[PDB]
Each structure stands twice: as C-alpha cells, then as structure tokens.
C-alpha cells in the first residue's frame, strides 16, 4: 500500500469514529460507523495473505449485519417517536434490538466468535488498531443511550463476555487469540459497569486502551506471534520479557498495578447499586484470565527457554523501529494507582 | 377524552359561489385587487386562531364579497370575460401566455366599465396589514401549564470538604 | 401502528434470517444483505413521506448511498476469495480456524 | 455522577470558575509523584533502546518529567474542581430539600438500649 | 389506473405473441436439433464454468459512479432555492470529487483492463 | 419469565405436582436452548442423530429439573420446613447423580452433587433474602 | 452528543434535521408540527428524566398524531360494527354517505 | 380490488424477498430482488412519492446488473441451482411462502395482530393525510434541500464515495 493511501485510510477510520462521537443525528452516527467499516477492511488487507482475506471477510459480514440491525432500530425509533436525536429509545423493541446491534461491533455476546478469528488472521499492528480504536465508537453510543437500557440484557451480555472470554483464553497458545479473549473479558467488565456509571466505563476503557497498546507494541517490538517465539526473546532481549510479565500482571488486574484500578472502581460502583452477586462473580472469574496471563509470563521471562544459535547474529544487530509512546505507555500501564481519584476528571 | 365540538350544519350553509377553475383563473388578478380585504381578514383569522371551526363567519363574508365581484363582472363585462375564460379553459395548463388579446379586451372593459386595473407583477404577493377587530388568541395551541424549571444552580464554590473523600486518599 | 409497516418489517425479518444463514455461496448472502437494505429504504421512505418530514427525505438517498458502497466492498472481498480460492463458497473458507 | 449539569460548555479543561478555588500547590505529593512517573518513563525509554538507563539522554529524561508535571498540574486542577462541584451540588441540594434530610433528636448512650452479648 | 393498465396491455400482448410463436408452427424436435451450437463441431463442454471478466474493477466502480448520480439528480429542483452560493459550491464539490475519483482510478491503472 | 414465574406462584413444598411440572419445564427449556447452541456451533451429521442429540440434552435437563422439583416439594412438606435451604440441596444430589447417571459417570455426578446443591441453596437463599442478581440502577 | 463539538464551535451540522418542527424548506409544516412543538417546548431544560413524568400527555398526543390508533382503532371498531349490523338490516346508510 | 393495491404490492415484495432469501443461484436471487425492488418502487409511488421509487429502481438495477456480471464470472458453478432443484432451497422457499401466507392470514381477518408490534390492519388509505402541496411536491423540495441545507451530509457522502473507490482499488490490488 502506498503510504499516502494508508495515511488517508487511517484518517478516514479516525474520522468515522469522531463522527460517531460528535454527532447527535442517528443517521450521522451510522455514517461514521459505515466510514469506519469501509476504511477498516483495507487496513487488514494491507499484508495481503489468505489469512488476511479470511479475517477481513469475517470482520465485514458481521459488522454489516450489525449496522443493518442498527438501522432497523433507528427506523423503529423514528417511527414510534419521530426523533433522530441520540437521547433514548422510545420503543422497547428498538432498544432491545440495538443492544445486540451495538454488541457485535464490540464482540462481547455469543456475537464474539469473529473477534479471535479476525485478530489471528490479520497482522499484529492492524490487530492493535482493531482491538483499541474500533471500540470507542460503539461504546460512545452505548454511553449516550445508557439512560434507557434494559439492565438484565446488558448484564447478561457482560457476564457471557467475561465468562467465555476468560475460558477461551485458557486454550490458545497464539498471542493474537488470547489477546482477543482478553479483550472480550475487558469488554465484559466495562459493559457490566455501563448501566450504573458511565464514568467508570470510560476509566476502564482508557486503562484498557493504554495497557493493550503497551502489550501489543511490546509484541511488535519482540516480533513474536506464537508462545515459543515470545519465549525465545529472553536470549535476544530480556528487558522486553521483563516488561512483558509486569504488563501481564496488570492484564490480570493484580494490584497495586494499574489494571486493578478499573476492576476495583467497577466493584465499588455496582455494590453501591445493591449488586453483590455480580461483582463477586466477575472477581472470581477474572482468575481464568489471570491463569493464562501467568502461563504466558512463565514461558516468557520467569523461566528462560531453549534459544537458537543463530540469535548470536540477532544480538549483533539492534532494532530500527522506534515504537513511539511505548515507555510512557508502560508507565501508565503499571503505576497510576496512587492517582486513582483523578477519574473525577472524566466525570 | 373530551368533546370534538363541531358547528351545526346551519352555520356552514354559505351561498356556495359556483364558477369553474378556469373562470376563477381568468378573473384572478382583478378579483385579488378588488376583493383583498375579505380574503386577508379571513386568512389572518385562520392563521391566528388556527381553528377553522372558529372563523366560519369570515368564510361567509369572503364568499359574499366574491359573489358580489362576480355579479358586477356579469353586469358590466359579460362578453369579454366569457370569451377570455373560455380561451383560458381550452388550454390544458390554463396558461395566460396564449390568451393575451382576450385579456386586453377584458382589462379595458373592466377599466372603463368598473374602474379596475390589473395588479402589476408581484403586487398581488405582498404581505398586507389587516385592521381586524377580533382579539389575539392568548393560547392558540391550547397549551397546558409548563413544568417548573429545575432549581437553578448558583453560589460560590469552596474546596471539596476533606479533599476527594475517595478511600484512603486524603487529598 | 398501521399495516404496510407490518409487511416491510416482516420482509426485513426474513432478510435478516436469510443473511444469518449460509448455504453455499457468498453472492447469495450479499444479495440478502442488499434486500435488508431495500426493506430499510422502503420503511424509512414510508415513515417520512407519511409524517411530511420534508427535510428528512434525503435520508433514504443517503441510505442507498452507503448501501451501494457496502455492496461494492463485499463483492470485492468475494473477488479476493475467488482469486485465492477459485470459487466463492464459504464452507471451504476455514484456514483461520486454527 | 455530572455531564448534564446546566451551564457546562463542552471541550475545555477548566470552565473559568475553577480559578476561584485554591490552585494545587507545586509541592503537592500527587504532583511530584506524577513527576516520578516522568522519571520512570525516561528509564524505560533508555532501557527499551539499550542505553545507559541512568546517564543516557539526560535531555530526554528531563523532557519526560517536565511534560508529566505540566499535564499533572492541569489534571490536578481539573480533578479538584469536580470534587468541589460535587460538594457544591450536594449541599445545595441538601438545603433545597430539608424534608428529605431529617435532623436527629440527639441523645446519649445512657438512654440507648444497646444489647450486650456475653462473650463465652 | 392508467399506468398498470398500460403495463398489463404490453405484458399480455407479449405473452400472447410468445404463445402463437410457440404453439402454432407445428414443431418437430429431436435431440441433435436442440444440441448446443458451437460453430459446427460439438462443444468442448462448459457454458457455465467461470468466465473471467477483467474489468471487474471497472464494473464495480460503475456501481459507485451510478450511485453518485442519485445525489446528482435533485439538481433541477436544487437550483431553485434562495441559497444559490451554497448549492453551487456543493454541486461543484460533488463533480470535483467524481473527477478526483476518476483521475485516481485512471492514474492507478484502474480503468485499464486486466490481462 | 412467566415460565419461571410458574415456580414462584406455587408456594414451596405444597402443590408438589405443579411445582415439579414447572421445574421440569424450566429444565426442558434450558435443554433445548443448550441443544440448539450445540447443533449450531458443533455441526451434527443428519436429522435423526440431531434429534438424538437434542433429545439427550433435553432429557437430561428435564430429568434434572423434575427431580429437583420433586425433592424440594417432598422435603419441604415431609419435614414441614419450607424455608429450609437444604430442601434444595437434595435437588442437588438428585440433580447430581442422575446427571452423572445421564452420562454414565460416577465422579461427574459426585461433584455435581456439591456444586449444584450449593448453587441451589444460594438461589433459594435469594428467596429468603432480598438479593438481586440483576439490580436496577439505583445510585 | 458524546463530545459536542457543535455547541463549542457554534456550528450546525446535524441539528437542522433532528426534529420535525425545525425550519423546513419553503416553510412546509410537518404533519405533527404543533404536537412536536408543544412537547419540545414542554420538556426543555427540565431534564430528560423529569420529561417522562411531567410532559407525558404532550408526548402521548404527539405519538398518537404520529401513528394515530387511539383514533384509528375507533374507526376500525366503528366500521366493524357498521358492517356487522348492516348485514341483517338494523341500519341503512344515508344517501349522502354513498352518493 | 383497487381498494388495497398497496397490500398486494407488499405481498409481492415479501414473495420476492423469500425468492432471494432462500439462497438460490445468485442469478435467480438477483431476479427475485429485482421483482421485489420493482414492487417496492410501486409501493413508494402509491404512497405519494415519485422520485424515491424511481431512484430505488435505477440504483438497484445498476447494482443487481453488476451482481449478475460478477455471478456468472466468479460465483458460478457447472450446475447452477433452481428454487426447486435442491431440497434445501426448496425447504427455504416453502418455509418463507407458507410463513408469509399464515402471517397475512392472521393479519387481514382479525386486523389487530400483536406480533412484535400492535398491527391494526384496517386499510392503508386510512392513514393518509388531507393536505395541500400547492405548486411544489413535498418530496422534491425535500431531496432538493440536500445542496442547500445538508452541506455536512454532502461532504461526508462525497468523502465516503471517494474513499470507497480508494478501498475498492486497494482491496482488489492483489499484491
Ligand atoms: C488513551 C491515551 C493513551 C494513548 C494515546 C495514543 C497512543 C498512540 C500510539 C501510536 C503508536 C504508533 C505505532 O507505533 O504504530 C506502529 C504500527 C506500525 O508498525 P510497523 O509495522 O513497524 O510500521 C511499518 C510501517 O507502517 C510501514 O509503512 P508503509 O511504508 O506501508 O507506509 C504507510 C505508513 C505511512 O506513514 C506516514 O505517512 C508517516 O504508515 C505508517 O507509518 C503507520 C503509522 C501512520 C500514522 C498516521 C497518523 C495520522 C494522524 O502502526 C500502527 O499500529 C498504527 C495504528 C493506528 C494509529 C495508532 C492508534 C493507536 C491508539 C488508538 C486509541 C487512541 C486512544 C483512544 C482513547
Ligand atoms: C491517573 C489514573 C486515573 C486516570 C483518569 C483519566 C485521566 C486522563 C483523562 C482525563 C483528561 C482528558 C479528558 C478530559 C478532557 O480533557 O475533557 C473532558 C471533557 C470534554 O468535553 P465533554 O465532557 O463535552 O465531552 C466528553 C464527554 N464525556 C465526559 C462523557 C467523556 O470535559 C471537558 O473538557 C470540560 C467540559 C465538560 C465537563 C464534563
Ligand atoms: C460455604 C457454605 C455455606 C453454607 C451453605 C449452606 C448450608 C446450609 O444450608 O446450612 C444450614 C444451616 C442451618 O442452621 P440453623 O437453622 O441452626 O441456623 C440458620 C441461621 N439462622 C438461625 C439465622 C436462620 O446453617 C449452617 O449449616 C451454617 C454453617 C455456617 C458455617 C459454614 C462453614 C463452611 C466452610
Ligand atoms: C457455579 C458453579 C457450579 C454450578 C455449575 C456447574 C454444575 C456442574 C458441576 C460439575 C461439573 C463437571 C465435574 C466433572 C467431574 O466431577 O469429573 C469427575 C472428577 C474428575 O475425575 P478425573 O478425571 O480427575 O479422574 C482421574 C483422576 N486422576 C487424574 C488423578 C487419575 O472426579 C473427581 O474429581 C472425584 C470425584 C469428585 C470429588 C469431589 C466431590 C466433592 C465436591 C468438590 C467441590 C466442592 C465445592
Ligand atoms: C517487579 C519488576 C521485576 C520483576 C522481575 C523481572 C523478571 C526477572 C528478572 C530478570 C529478567 C531478565 C534480565 O536480564 O533482567 C535484567 C534486565 C537487563 O539485563 P542487562 O542487559 O544485563 O542490564 C544492563 C543494565 N545496564 O533488566 C530487567 O529485567 C529490568 C527489570 C525491570 C522491571 C520493570 C520495572 C518497571 C518499573 C517499576
Ligand atoms: C441461577 C439461577 C437463577 C434463577 C433460579 C430460579 C429462581 C428465581 O426466581 O431466581 C431469581 C431470583 C429470585 O426470584 P424470586 O421470584 O424473587 O425468588 C424465587 C421465587 N421462588 O432473583 C434474585 O435476584 C435472587 C437471587 C438469585 C440467586 C443469586 C445467587 C445464585 C448463586 C450464586 C451464584 C452462582
């Protein structure tokens, strides 16, 4: 891809997301979604392998189904209310239909099998983009319309995302798949906290965005895609694996690392809303995420693995890609807990 | 729940002026010139009250004045008006473009028989001021009492008592 | 809540069911998607024409505008699956399962 | 909680009124800790690039801590303003609704019948 | 009233002409008569196997081009507004963007057929 | 929700037949849901064996719900202890062993005893208290 | 909007189409302009949570005007009862109702 | 009779939808969508809208022609299927047709069906409004305001179309 073309496509993805997060008209929000979908496929197809074609397809048809469903909801709302403004749904059917219409975009419900597939098929950089930037728009729409959600549906969605993500992550050695399942689990956390206080949803989303950025760019700088290849990084470059394990402990949410602050704050919120079984359930089932986080950490830094002799030349040559914002990203990824009350800035 | 009040059939028993659309189109400009007061009063009543069940008397008076206008044109310029409206009626779109000679005959007839002049281009489309004597409807939309506005937020701001008050963070 | 709306909504429902079920090909699913789009256009047009929302008649035109764009992108995806696969069927599209 | 408060103007850090609050002190432990994050970010940056993590690129580390402190100051001012707004909306609503905030006819423990549990 | 009466007249007249064409002439059919025509000799055997079309890019961008004319066609009524400056700017915006799209395709092979 | 409400209308213990029927229907509904998901994600081979799979799942689930209902009502009536959480605990081992006896496994139903009975005790405790698994936004 | 840039810049991008009572081309009124105007002017600044309880009958009238079957159900039962009782000769329509 | 018209056209719309939703050969699915789009344009015409129906007509015929041109090129088989050839497509067609049959059956007798939404099916002539459009069609002034009012929509649609051509170029590049 011509670099200018790639820049324009990225700008169009960002412009679609911005149009979603700044427009009041429902049609304009859908137009932003459409621009995002339209510009996302070539980014995946950048490397042009059959894996990329497979993943880009599976991405497309799911998103297209979700967007058409979103139109069905918008049109029903207009029919029953006569308003395009993004305030609240005046027809229960329209909203209990858009809840999953906006869900396949996030990929949390049983509408989640597409996420690991697309993540594994496409390249790692576009995987970072898909798992970080492609979630602000539907989450923004959900935040705007959170006033009129059916809490039972949204909470069931969040529970299923958490449970299946944590369980599926236990049975993959490819980094892209277990990161997709981790993203599903974090989607479940944020979507669970969504109906009560959207500020905690924003805080968890920001923490997840920065921390997944740090994790993925560490993966890119390590040039690893399978567990064995990542384990081999210790001989060539040990500081990457050392930061890997700390960032994985943050993935699991072990305090005093940054990853606890959302998991903590979310639990503080819904227990204020008389919800006690749900926070305990999520707190216990995050251990499934933690298990494969520690499995990845064990065979990356905590136990040095059989290396390859040709790495004698690999140590001889340094890196060239700068990986901008990485050292800052690790810092906000591990130690921001003492500045927890700063979440009031979001509110 | 309520009453759909409807005036009885006696009030809307107007004389029901009977001329075809072509005849109306032929005398359009002169009628608009020499009948503007009843039309304007009736329409201002219609737009202000927003209730045709209320301004029926103006609907009577406009028809009375229209019938008076047509009676005058019958009494003074029957033949040129008849030929002009027939020639207008022949056209499918009822265009004034094809019928100009008959228009000239009609115009001169009404000018020297009833003291009329056709309005110039755009004269018949200017907003007029009526001197109606009815009151202004206080609640044309029959709107109910508006909900009281939310209590306004005001007052000087002081530092939050004991800082954030969020767990062990004192400051 | 009138009658024609029932028929258009029901047509959209069957088109949604048809999209969410594949049999062999990729073109058929795309056609079912554009049928969903057709039902959306007819429904929205009915709604706005009925309500005399004159400023909103552009909305079905913009619907069709992005409709054609998605159809084009989907069939280009099918071009690539045919180029790397010879055919367009979806059951043989399994290389990403593991 | 406050995204719908009347008078809010979107997309601007401090809404002018916040200057009536005491600005956070430059010594503030929250601020200096955010400066510490600036130092740490420099350490990873040198370590991530195979550099003498302590001595390498003094300017780069110096830029890191300075940048963190500046955004640290504005975040702290923004943080304190919201908490001040939370207290303002609280007490104003408390005063505006006396019936929903009853007062308690204060009495001492000598008249409270607090049951005692024998610890056996 | 009129339009479907018309359409019905055309379709029934056509279906009739088909009927007289297909039932009157007293056909006599055998297998080799209805055999596919392949310039004499028997066809190799296909007529439904994939037939490559090298203007697939051109064919698909026709869809976007013909789509834009939907935006373009309200112009005869759009000219009769009170904001001619904005209407002119937006119409020239559509036309300039179509020109840019066509030029991008022309320069980046695009309209040129595949081989 | 009304299908679940059928259990709610019948007081615990009394009207054991209606409660057993309601619990059997709960089990069967969950059974066809699980079997539908199973034949969706996991491909079957034909119609008759697909019926075999969904019938096995709905049979297991309907038996589980039925025996849970029967054990609950007969235990609450025989002991005159309707509020007893352990009333549901027999539904656990009944739910356990037969489930293992549905899979012809010993440890399966052995662990299912404790797991399902404990969860049954806590859900019953949801009736005893004012617990809300899906709490509406209050603060 | 999430990040309402439009109010910050004072620029209109989509607010013109949001409601039926806005300035339509050539001042063409909406079918339910009056009801929408009354409902909107009712619950403005009052709060989107107080709107449901306070401005209820206004929104009910507006939604009726949009869909109209507390009126069309009236018509349907009127027609049903008419066709019912006319069948066995209880009522005959007046001449003005069939020509 | 001419009383309903819109009802019958909606039934043909649904039947055309069933035709291509049954996953037949893509040419036959295109034909089914063609008849569905034509009768939908008829419905929009009968509901006081002329430009919108003809726009659906033209745009969808262009799109479906390109779908055909791709179908016989890429998405074809040595044995194209019919709505009666395979038992799966026959089953889908049967399910759709009998379904819509029983939906319209439950609809046009009781005329008070609750399904999803309350559907009081008296007649589509009822909901029409007594109005006066003067010397301008409302739909014409409506879609003519795109260049005067909806400037933002103009910008976003043009940008989306240009970048759609860009992506149609990039996806089909093939190394
Ligand atoms: C929250 C707060 C914290 C987070 C704040 C934001 C952090 C952003 C981190 C950016 C990291 C960039 C990076 O290292 O990318 C490497 C990676 C490519 O690594 P590589 O494979 O070594 O690069 C080879 C070249 O691309 C090969 O290039 P080529 O020869 O194929 O030509 C294409 C080239 C063209 O490059 C140029 O023209 C320059 O493209 C690039 O260079 C890629 C970057 C383009 C950036 C354009 C920015 C426009 C504004 O690029 C990306 O991952 C880009 C993703 C899209 C932008 C970043 C979005 C991440 C954040 C999303 C959420 C934002 C916050 C939401 C709340
Ligand atoms: C350290 C650990 C805790 C970290 C917590 C998050 C810190 C980083 C995020 C806060 C700073 C950047 C976002 C805030 C900002 O600049 O503008 C917010 C926003 C931007 O405007 P806005 O509020 O109209 O749009 C964003 C909408 N919400 C808040 C729902 C996400 O607020 C303001 O700028 C002030 C006016 C509106 C106030 C509400
Ligand atoms: C973890 C397991 C927690 C208890 C699970 C339910 C057990 C049960 O039903 O017990 C009923 C019985 C009923 O006893 P009870 O009826 O005498 O008293 C119940 C409590 N009041 C009086 C307030 C109603 O309770 C227990 O067995 C309590 C056991 C507590 C200690 C558990 C330790 C687990 C390790
Ligand atoms: C919420 C969670 C609970 C409700 C939802 C789940 C309901 C179903 C629960 C059962 C799930 C499947 C259990 C599988 C199983 O037991 O397999 C046979 C299992 C596993 O057998 P195994 O496969 O390990 O057998 C071979 C053993 N080795 C490897 C050493 C040679 O059997 C056993 O573990 C032994 C019998 C049960 C022992 C424990 C009984 C007491 C209860 C313990 C938990 C208390 C709390
Ligand atoms: C808690 C954090 C540490 C948790 C344990 C880390 C993994 C186990 C320790 C050994 C890792 C392998 C290794 O080689 O460690 C040393 C490595 C740098 O090795 P070397 O290149 O010799 O250093 C030259 C410095 N001038 O350097 C490192 O491993 C640096 C470790 C940094 C850990 C993250 C700190 C974040 C901020 C707090
Ligand atoms: C898991 C299954 C949940 C459903 C079981 C069926 C019983 C039921 O109604 O549960 C919902 C529950 C209480 O519903 P309610 O009708 O108020 O009480 C029971 C009436 N017989 O609704 C509630 O909010 C009560 C608490 C339900 C149980 C929560 C704890 C479950 C066990 C721990 C997690 C596993």
UniProtKB/Swiss-Prot annotation, chain A:
It catalyses: a ubiquinone + NADH + 5 H(+)(in) = a ubiquinol + NAD(+) + 4 H(+)(out). It comes from the Eukaryota. Its EC number is 7.1.1.2. One of its GO terms (biological process) is reactive oxygen species metabolic process. Keywords: Electron transport, Membrane, Mitochondrion, Mitochondrion inner membrane, NAD, Respiratory chain, Translocase, Transmembrane, Transmembrane helix, Transport, Ubiquinone. It is an enzyme of class 7 (translocase). It is found in: Mitochondrion inner membrane. GO terms for cellular component: mitochondrial inner membrane; respiratory chain complex I. It is a multi-pass membrane protein. The keyword tRNA processing does not apply. It holds the Pfam family NADH_dehy_S2_C. Its main location: mitochondrion. GO terms for molecular function: NADH dehydrogenase (ubiquinone) activity. The chain crosses the membrane at residues 3-23, 25-45, 59-79, 89-109, 149-169, 178-198, 200-220, 237-257, 274-294, 325-345. The keyword Magnesium does not apply. InterPro entries: Complex_I_Subunit_2, NADH_DH_su2_C, NADH_UbQ_OxRdtase_chain2, ND/Mrp_TM. Core subunit of respiratory chain NADH dehydrogenase (Complex I) which is composed of 45 different subunits. Interacts with TMEM242. Core subunit of the mitochondrial membrane respiratory chain NADH dehydrogenase (Complex I) which catalyzes electron transfer from NADH through the respiratory chain, using ubiquinone as an electron acceptor. Essential for the catalytic activity and assembly of complex I. Belongs to the complex I subunit 2 family. This is NADH-ubiquinone oxidoreductase chain 2. The gene is MT-ND2.
From Swiss-Prot, chain C:
It catalyses: a ubiquinone + NADH + 5 H(+)(in) = a ubiquinol + NAD(+) + 4 H(+)(out). InterPro entries: NADH_UbQ_OxRdtase_chain4L/K (IPR001133), NUOK/Mnh_C1-like (IPR039428). Keywords: Electron transport, Membrane, Mitochondrion, Mitochondrion inner membrane, NAD, Respiratory chain, Translocase, Transmembrane, Transmembrane helix, Transport, Ubiquinone. The chain crosses the membrane at residues 1-21, 29-49, 61-81. Its EC number is 7.1.1.2. It is an enzyme of class 7 (translocase). Pfam families: Oxidored_q2. One of its GO terms (molecular function) is NADH dehydrogenase (ubiquinone) activity. It is a multi-pass membrane protein. It is found in: Mitochondrion inner membrane. Its main location: mitochondrion. GO terms for biological process: ATP synthesis coupled electron transport. Gene3D superfamilies: 1.10.287.3510. Coiled coil: none annotated. Core subunit of the mitochondrial membrane respiratory chain NADH dehydrogenase (Complex I) which catalyzes electron transfer from NADH through the respiratory chain, using ubiquinone as an electron acceptor. Part of the enzyme membrane arm which is embedded in the lipid bilayer and involved in proton translocation. Core subunit of respiratory chain NADH dehydrogenase (Complex I) which is composed of 45 different subunits. This is NADH-ubiquinone oxidoreductase chain 4L. It comes from Sus scrofa (Pig).
From Swiss-Prot, chain E:
One of its GO terms (molecular function) is NADH dehydrogenase (ubiquinone) activity. The gene is MT-ND3. It catalyses: a ubiquinone + NADH + 5 H(+)(in) = a ubiquinol + NAD(+) + 4 H(+)(out). Core subunit of respiratory chain NADH dehydrogenase (Complex I) which is composed of 45 different subunits. Interacts with TMEM186. Interacts with TMEM242. It is an enzyme of class 7 (translocase). Keywords: Electron transport, Membrane, Mitochondrion, Mitochondrion inner membrane, NAD, Respiratory chain, Translocase, Transmembrane, Transmembrane helix, Transport, Ubiquinone. InterPro entries: NADH_UbQ/plastoQ_OxRdtase_su3, NDAH_ubi_oxred_su3_sf. This is NADH-ubiquinone oxidoreductase chain 3.
UniProtKB/Swiss-Prot annotation, chain H:
It catalyses: a ubiquinone + NADH + 5 H(+)(in) = a ubiquinol + NAD(+) + 4 H(+)(out). It is found in: Mitochondrion inner membrane. GO terms for cellular component: mitochondrial inner membrane; mitochondrion; respiratory chain complex I. Its EC number is 7.1.1.2. One of its GO terms (biological process) is mitochondrial electron transport, NADH to ubiquinone. One of its GO terms (molecular function) is NADH dehydrogenase (ubiquinone) activity. InterPro entries: ComplexI_Subunit6, NADH_UbQ/plastoQ_OxRdtase_su6, Nuo/plastoQ_OxRdtase_6_NuoJ. Pfam families: Oxidored_q3. The chain crosses the membrane at residues 1-21, 25-45, 47-67, 88-108, 149-169. Core subunit of respiratory chain NADH dehydrogenase (Complex I) which is composed of 45 different subunits. Core subunit of the mitochondrial membrane respiratory chain NADH dehydrogenase (Complex I) which catalyzes electron transfer from NADH through the respiratory chain, using ubiquinone as an electron acceptor. Essential for the catalytic activity and assembly of complex I. Belongs to the complex I subunit 6 family. This is NADH-ubiquinone oxidoreductase chain 6. It comes from Sus scrofa.
